[PDB]
Short mmCIF file of C-alpha atoms and ligand atoms in Angstrom, two decimals:
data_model
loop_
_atom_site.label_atom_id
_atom_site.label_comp_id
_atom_site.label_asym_id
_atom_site.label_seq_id
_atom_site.Cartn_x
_atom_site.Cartn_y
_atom_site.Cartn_z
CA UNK S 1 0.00 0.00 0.00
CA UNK S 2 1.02 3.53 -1.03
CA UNK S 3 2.03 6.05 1.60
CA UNK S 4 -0.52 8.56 -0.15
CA UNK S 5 -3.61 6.01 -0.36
CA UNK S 6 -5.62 8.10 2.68
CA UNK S 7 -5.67 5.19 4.88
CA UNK S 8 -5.59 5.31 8.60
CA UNK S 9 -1.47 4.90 10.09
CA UNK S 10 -0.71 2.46 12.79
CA UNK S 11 2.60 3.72 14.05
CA UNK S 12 5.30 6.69 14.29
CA UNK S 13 8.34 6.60 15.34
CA UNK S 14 9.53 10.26 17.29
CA UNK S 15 11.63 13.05 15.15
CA UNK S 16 15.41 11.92 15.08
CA UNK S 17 17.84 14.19 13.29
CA UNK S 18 14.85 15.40 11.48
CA UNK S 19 13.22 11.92 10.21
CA UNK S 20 11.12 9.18 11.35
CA UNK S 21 9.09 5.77 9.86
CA UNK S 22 5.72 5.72 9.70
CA UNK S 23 4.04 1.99 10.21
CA UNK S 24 0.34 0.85 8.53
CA UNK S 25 -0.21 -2.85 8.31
CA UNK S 26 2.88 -4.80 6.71
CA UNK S 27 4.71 -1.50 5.37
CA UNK S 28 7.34 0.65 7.10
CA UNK S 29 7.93 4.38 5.26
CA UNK S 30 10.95 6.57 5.70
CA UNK S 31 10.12 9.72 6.01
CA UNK S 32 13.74 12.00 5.74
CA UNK S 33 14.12 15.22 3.12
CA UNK S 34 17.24 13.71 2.87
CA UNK S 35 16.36 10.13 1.37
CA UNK S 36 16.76 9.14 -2.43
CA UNK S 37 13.26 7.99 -2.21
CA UNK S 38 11.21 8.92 0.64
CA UNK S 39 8.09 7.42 1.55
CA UNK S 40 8.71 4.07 -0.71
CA UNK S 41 6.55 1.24 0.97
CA UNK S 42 9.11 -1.60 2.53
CA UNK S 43 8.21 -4.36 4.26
CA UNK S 44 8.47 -4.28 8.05
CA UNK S 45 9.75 -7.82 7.65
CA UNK S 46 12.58 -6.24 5.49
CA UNK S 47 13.39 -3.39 6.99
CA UNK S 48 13.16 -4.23 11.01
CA UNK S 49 13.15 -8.12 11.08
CA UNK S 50 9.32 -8.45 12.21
CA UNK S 51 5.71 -9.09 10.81
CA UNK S 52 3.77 -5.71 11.12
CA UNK S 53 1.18 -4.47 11.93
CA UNK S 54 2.59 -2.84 14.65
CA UNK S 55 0.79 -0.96 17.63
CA UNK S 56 3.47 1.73 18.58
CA UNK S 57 6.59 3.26 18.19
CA UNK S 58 9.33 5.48 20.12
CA UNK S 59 12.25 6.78 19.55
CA UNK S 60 14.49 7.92 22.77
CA UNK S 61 16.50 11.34 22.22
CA UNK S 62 19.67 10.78 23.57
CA UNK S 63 22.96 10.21 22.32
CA UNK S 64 21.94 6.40 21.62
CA UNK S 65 18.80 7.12 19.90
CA UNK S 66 17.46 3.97 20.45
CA UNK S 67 13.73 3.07 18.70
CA UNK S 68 11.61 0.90 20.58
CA UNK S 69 8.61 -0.84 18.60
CA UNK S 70 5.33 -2.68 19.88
CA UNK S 71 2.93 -5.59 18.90
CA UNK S 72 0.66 -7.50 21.54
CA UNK S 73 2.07 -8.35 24.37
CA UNK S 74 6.00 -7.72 23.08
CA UNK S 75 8.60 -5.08 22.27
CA UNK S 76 11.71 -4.73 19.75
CA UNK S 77 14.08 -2.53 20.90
CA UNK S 78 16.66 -1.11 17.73
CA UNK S 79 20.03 1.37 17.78
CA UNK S 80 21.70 1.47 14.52
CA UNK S 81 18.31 0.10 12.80
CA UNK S 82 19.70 -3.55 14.02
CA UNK S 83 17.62 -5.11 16.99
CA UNK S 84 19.44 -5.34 20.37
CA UNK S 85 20.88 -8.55 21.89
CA UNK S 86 18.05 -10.28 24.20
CA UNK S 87 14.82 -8.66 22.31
CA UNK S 88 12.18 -8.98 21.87
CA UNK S 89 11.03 -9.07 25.40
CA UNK S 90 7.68 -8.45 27.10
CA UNK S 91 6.27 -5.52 27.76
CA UNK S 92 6.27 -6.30 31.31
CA UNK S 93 9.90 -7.26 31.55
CA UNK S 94 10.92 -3.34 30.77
CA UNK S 95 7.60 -1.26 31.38
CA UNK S 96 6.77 -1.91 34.98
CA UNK S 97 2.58 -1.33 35.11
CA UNK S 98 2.38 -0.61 30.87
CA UNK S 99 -0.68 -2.34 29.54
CA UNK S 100 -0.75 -4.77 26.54
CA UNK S 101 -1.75 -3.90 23.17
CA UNK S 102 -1.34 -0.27 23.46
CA UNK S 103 -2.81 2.34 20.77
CA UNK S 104 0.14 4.83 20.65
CA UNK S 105 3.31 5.90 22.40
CA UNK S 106 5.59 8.81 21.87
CA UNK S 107 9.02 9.82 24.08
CA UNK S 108 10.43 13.23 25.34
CA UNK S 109 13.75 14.16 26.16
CA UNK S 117 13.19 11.69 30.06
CA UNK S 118 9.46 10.49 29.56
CA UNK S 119 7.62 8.06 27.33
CA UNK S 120 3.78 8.18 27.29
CA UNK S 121 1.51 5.38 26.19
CA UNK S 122 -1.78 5.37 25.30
CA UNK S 123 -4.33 3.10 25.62
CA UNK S 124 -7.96 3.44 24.50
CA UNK S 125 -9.35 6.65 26.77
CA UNK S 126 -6.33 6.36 28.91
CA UNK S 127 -2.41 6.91 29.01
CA UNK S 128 0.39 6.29 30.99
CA UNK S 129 4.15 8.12 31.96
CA UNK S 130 7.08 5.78 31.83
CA UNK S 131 10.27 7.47 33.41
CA UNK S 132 13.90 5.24 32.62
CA UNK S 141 -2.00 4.86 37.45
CA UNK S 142 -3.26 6.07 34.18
CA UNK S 143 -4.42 9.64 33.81
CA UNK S 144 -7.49 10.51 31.11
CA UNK S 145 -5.81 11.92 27.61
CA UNK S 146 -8.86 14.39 27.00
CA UNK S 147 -8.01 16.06 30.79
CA UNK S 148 -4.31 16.36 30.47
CA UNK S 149 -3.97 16.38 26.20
CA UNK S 150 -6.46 19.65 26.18
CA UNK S 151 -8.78 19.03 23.08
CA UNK S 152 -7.80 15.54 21.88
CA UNK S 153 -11.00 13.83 22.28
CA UNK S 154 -9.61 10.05 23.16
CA UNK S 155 -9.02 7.34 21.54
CA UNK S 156 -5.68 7.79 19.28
CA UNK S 157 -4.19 5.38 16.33
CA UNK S 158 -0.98 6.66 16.83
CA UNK S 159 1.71 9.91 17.69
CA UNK S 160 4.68 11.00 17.48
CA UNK S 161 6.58 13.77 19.48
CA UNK S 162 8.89 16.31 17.73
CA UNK S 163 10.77 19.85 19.34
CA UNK S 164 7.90 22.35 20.11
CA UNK S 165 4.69 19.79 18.95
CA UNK S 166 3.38 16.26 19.54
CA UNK S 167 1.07 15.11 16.94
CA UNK S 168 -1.92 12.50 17.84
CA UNK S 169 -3.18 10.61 14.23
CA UNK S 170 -7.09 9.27 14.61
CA UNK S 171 -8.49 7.46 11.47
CA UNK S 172 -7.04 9.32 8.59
CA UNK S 173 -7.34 12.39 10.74
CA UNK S 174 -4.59 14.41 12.98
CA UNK S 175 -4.25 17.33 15.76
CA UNK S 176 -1.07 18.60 16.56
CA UNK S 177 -0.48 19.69 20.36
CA UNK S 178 1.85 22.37 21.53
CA UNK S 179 4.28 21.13 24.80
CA UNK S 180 4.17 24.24 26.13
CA UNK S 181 0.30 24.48 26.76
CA UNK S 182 -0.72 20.54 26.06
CA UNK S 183 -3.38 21.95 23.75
CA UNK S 184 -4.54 21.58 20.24
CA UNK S 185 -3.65 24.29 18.07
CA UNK S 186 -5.31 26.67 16.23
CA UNK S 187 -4.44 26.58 12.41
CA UNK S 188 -6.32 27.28 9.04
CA UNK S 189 -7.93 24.88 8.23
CA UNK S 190 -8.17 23.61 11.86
CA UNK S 191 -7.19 20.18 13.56
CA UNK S 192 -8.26 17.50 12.75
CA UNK S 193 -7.54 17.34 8.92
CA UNK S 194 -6.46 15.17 6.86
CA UNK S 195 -2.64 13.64 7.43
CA UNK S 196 -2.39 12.76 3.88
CA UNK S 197 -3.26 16.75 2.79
CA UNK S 198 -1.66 18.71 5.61
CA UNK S 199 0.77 16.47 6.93
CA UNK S 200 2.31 14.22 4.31
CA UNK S 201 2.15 16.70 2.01
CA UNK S 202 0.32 14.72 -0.67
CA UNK S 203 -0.75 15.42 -4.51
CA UNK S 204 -4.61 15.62 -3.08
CA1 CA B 301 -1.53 1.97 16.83
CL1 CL B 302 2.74 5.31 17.80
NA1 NA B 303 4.96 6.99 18.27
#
């Protein structure tokens, strides 16, 4: 499947040096100004060593960089794009009280939250409510990804971006949520 097709995403990894993947069902998408070809649709199989989908992504920013990616019950953990020694491993093994089959996760620079239906969770190396805390994102999420100044929550083929500062949605022309293909990807529309 194309990265333009309009379909919902499953996955983001957090802004690294300015890129990230995006994840929907078996395909994993570079997203980089500074790739050849970006967006081509790879196979997660290929390009990470696992059968997609996957439920959620992270990428730690500190010197290692390392991405951390989760299905069901289990997590990958990568540096280098080549899986660590001794992964995967369950959830439970290196997320002390993070639930199974999460929705969506995203890291800051050191916090990673994950979210889970109505609910998410703070991991530092009980759930709170997303609507209280995440002012104006209405629940349930597909996926998110955190850069600098902005996180950005993805619903359906729908997004909001949120400012760190304030944890609110911001107010653009035309206003959250609209489409990720249009206004985020950048897609011939
Ligand atoms: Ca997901
Ligand atoms: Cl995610
Ligand atoms: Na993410």
């Amino acid at each position: 499947m194309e990265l333009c097709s309009g379909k919902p995403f499953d996955a983001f990894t957090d802004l690294k040096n300015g890129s990230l993947f995006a994840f929907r069902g078996q395909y994993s998408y570079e997203l980089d100004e500074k790739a050849v070809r970006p967006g081509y649709p790879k196979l997660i199989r290929d390009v990470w060593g696992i059968e997609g989908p996957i439920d959620a992504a992270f990428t730690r920013i500190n010197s290692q960089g390392k991405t951390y990616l989760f299905k069901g019950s289990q997590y990958w953990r990568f540096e280098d794009g080549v899986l660590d020694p001794d992964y995967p491993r369950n959830i439970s093994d290196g997320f002390d009280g993070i639930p199974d089959n999460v929705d969506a996760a995203l890291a800051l620079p050191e916090r990673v939250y994950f979210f889970k239906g109505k609910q998410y969770w703070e991991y530092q190396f009980q759930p709170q409510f997303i609507s209280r805390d995440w002012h104006g994102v209405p629940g349930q999420v597909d996926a998110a990804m955190a850069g600098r100044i902005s996180v950005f929550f993805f619903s359906g083929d729908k997004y909001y971006r949120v400012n760190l500062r304030t944890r609110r949605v911001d107010t653009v022309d035309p206003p959250y949520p609209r489409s990720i293909a249009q206004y985020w990807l950048g897609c011939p529309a």
